[PDB]
Paper text:
Langerhans cells are characterized by the presence of [name] ([name]), a C-type lectin that can act as a pathogen receptor by binding to surface glycoconjugates of microorganisms. [name] has an extracellular region that contains (1) a C-type carbohydrate-recognition domain (CRD) that binds sugars and (2) a neck region that mediates the formation of trimers. As in other C-type lectins, the CRD of [name] contains a conserved Ca2+ binding site that binds to carbohydrates. Here we report the identification of additional glycan ligands for [name] through screening of a microarray of bacterial lipopolysaccharides and high-resolution crystal structures of the [name] CRD bound to carbohydrates representing a spectrum of ligands.
In order to investigate the potential modes of binding of [name] to both eukaryotic and prokaryotic mannose-containing sugars, we determined the crystal structures for the monomeric full-length [name] CRD bound to various mannose-containing oligosaccharides. For both ligand complexes, electron density was observed in the conserved Ca2+ site in each of the four crystallographically independent copies of the CRD and was fitted with a mannose. In each copy, mannose binds with the 3-OH group interacting with the Ca2+ ligands Glu293 and Asn307, while the 4-OH group interacts with Glu285 and Asn287, which are part of the EPN motif. In this orientation, the axial 2-OH group forms a hydrogen bond with Lys299. In all of the Man4 complexes, as well as in most of the copies of the Man5 complex, only a single-mannose residue is visible, and it cannot be determined whether this corresponds to a particular mannose residue present in these ligands. However, in one copy of the CRD–Man5 complex, there is additional electron density that is best interpreted as an α1–3-linked mannose. Moreover, there is weak density emerging from the anomeric oxygen of this second sugar. These observations indicate that the mannose residue in the primary binding site corresponds to the outer α1–3-linked mannose residue at the nonreducing end of the Man5 oligosaccharide, consistent with the suggestion that [name] can bind to mannose residues at the nonreducing termini of branched structures.
Author numbering: 198 to 325
Write the structure that this text describes.
Amino acid sequence: GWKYFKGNFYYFSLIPKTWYSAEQFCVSRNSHLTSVTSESEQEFLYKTAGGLIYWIGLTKAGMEGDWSWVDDTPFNKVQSARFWIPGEPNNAGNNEHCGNIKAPSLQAWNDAPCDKTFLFICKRPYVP
Ligand SMILES: OC[C@H]1O[C@H](O[C@@H]2[C@H](O)[C@@H](O)O[C@H](CO)[C@H]2O)[C@@H](O)[C@@H](O)[C@@H]1O
Ligand SMILES: [Ca+2]
């Protein structure tokens, strides 16, 4: 059930999990919760999500609470600014340290508590 886009396969889960249990599922399938590195990938993801909320690979790193990608893609604060929902990340309840795709818009991301359960998206490279 993996979908193909620009050199990567993506798995849109049918069962919801916490952010970390989701990541562990992806890891068990030789993948990671997805990074987002272009407008075209953001568009593929939010369009495919079809208005449902999915965990993606966004999570905090370092003392300073900087956002990062679990697949180790360097996080580009400048180039990613256009991808959050207006007002996010807002760090609500001082307890939102993971990120999901929420709005079907280029401005799609929300920060949410890592222990909330949502559907999730794994990303696996194709290696010819
Ligand atoms: O408004 C953005 C905000 O939405 C969600 O927070 C909840 C809502 O704002 C609303 O239902 O009020 C709730 C109680 O105060 C609040 O929890 C979250 O998805 C949050 O991450 C987001 O920033
Ligand atoms: Ca939030």
